[PDB]
Amino acid sequence: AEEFPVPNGFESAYREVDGVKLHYVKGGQGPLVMLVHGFGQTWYEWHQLMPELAKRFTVIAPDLPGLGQSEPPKTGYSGEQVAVYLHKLARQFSPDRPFDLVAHDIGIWNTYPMVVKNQADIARLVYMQAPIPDARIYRFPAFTAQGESLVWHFSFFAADDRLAETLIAGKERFFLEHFIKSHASNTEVFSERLLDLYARSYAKPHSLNASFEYYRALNESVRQNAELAKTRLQMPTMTLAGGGHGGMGTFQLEQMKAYAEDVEGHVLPGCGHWLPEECAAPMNRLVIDFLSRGRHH
Amino acid sequence: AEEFPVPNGFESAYREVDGVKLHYVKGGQGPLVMLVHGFGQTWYEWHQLMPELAKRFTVIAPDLPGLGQSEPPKTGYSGEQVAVYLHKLARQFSPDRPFDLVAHDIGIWNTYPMVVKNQADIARLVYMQAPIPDARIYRFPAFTAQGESLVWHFSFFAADDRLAETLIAGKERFFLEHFIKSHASNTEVFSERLLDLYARSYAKPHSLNASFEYYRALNESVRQNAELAKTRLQMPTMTLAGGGHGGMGTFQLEQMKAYAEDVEGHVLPGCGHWLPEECAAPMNRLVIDFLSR
In a domain, A33, yes or no: yes
In a domain, A197, yes or no: yes
The residue among B283, B231, B285, B272 whose CA lies nearest residue B130 is B272
In a domain, B106, yes or no: yes
Out of B144, B171, B219, the one facing A166 most closely (by C-beta) is B171
The residue among B172, A75, A199, A233 whose CA lies nearest residue A190 is A199
Alpha-carbon distance B265 to B244, whole Å? 16
CB contact under 8 A, B175 and A167: yes
Coil, strand or helix at A25: strand
Q: How far is B222 from chain A (nearest CA, A)?
A: 9
Residue A124 CB neighbour total at 10 angstroms: 21
Measured between beta carbons, the chain A residues lying within 8 angstroms of B140 are 141-143
Helices (H), A162-248: 163-168, 172-182, 192-202, 205-216, 218-228
Q: What are the backbone angles phi and psi of residue A260, rounded to the nearest 5°?
A: -135, 135
Q: How far is A112 from chain B (nearest CA, A)?
A: 20
Alpha-carbon distance A173 to A170, whole Å? 8
- Could you tell me the residue range of the domain that residue A206 belongs to? 9-292
In a domain, B4, yes or no: no
Residue B26 CB neighbour total at 10 angstroms: 21
In a domain, B1, yes or no: no
Measured between beta carbons, the chain A residues lying within 8 angstroms of B146 are 219
Measured between beta carbons, the chain B residues lying within 8 angstroms of A149 are 142, 155
The residue among B154, B123, A103 whose CA lies nearest residue A86 is A103
The residue among A73, A107, A62 whose CA lies nearest residue A273 is A107
Q: How far is B67 from chain A (nearest CA, A)?
A: 22
In chain A, which ranges are E strands? Answer: 11-17, 20-28, 32-36, 58-62, 99-104, 122-128, 143-144, 147-148, 237-242, 263-268
In a domain, A1, yes or no: no
- The reply to whether B141 touches chain A by the CB within 8 Å rule is yes
Coil, strand or helix at B80: helix
In a domain, A198, yes or no: yes
Q: Which residues pair with A122 in a beta bridge?
A: A99
Alpha-carbon distance B200 to B177, whole Å? 12
Alpha-carbon distance A117 to A231, whole Å? 9
Conformation bin of residue B151: beta by default, left when phi > 0, alpha when psi is -120 to 50: alpha
Out of A143, A150, A175, the one facing B167 most closely (by C-beta) is A175
CB contact under 8 A, B141 and A142: yes
Out of A144, A146, A171, the one facing B167 most closely (by C-beta) is A171
Measured between beta carbons, the chain B residues lying within 8 angstroms of A146 are 219
Alpha-carbon distance B169 to B171, whole Å? 5
> How close are the terminal C-alpha atoms of chain B, in Å?
38
Alpha-carbon distance A291 to A105, whole Å? 19
Beta strand A99-104 pairing with B147-148: unpaired
CATH number at residue B161: 3.40.50.1820
> What does the DSSP 8-state code read for residue B285?
H
Measured between beta carbons, the chain A residues lying within 8 angstroms of B151 are 142-143
- The reply to whether A219 touches chain B by the CB within 8 Å rule is yes
Q: How far is B42 from chain A (nearest CA, A)?
A: 24
In a domain, A297, yes or no: no
Exp. method: X-ray
- The reply to whether A156 touches chain B by the CB within 8 Å rule is yes
Q: Which residue of B lies nearest to A171 if distances are taken between CA atoms?
A: B167
Total domain count for chain B?
A: 1
Q: Which residue of A lies nearest to B144 if distances are taken between CA atoms?
A: A138
Measured between beta carbons, the chain B residues lying within 8 angstroms of A218 are 143
Q: How far is B221 from chain A (nearest CA, A)?
A: 11
Coil, strand or helix at A207: helix
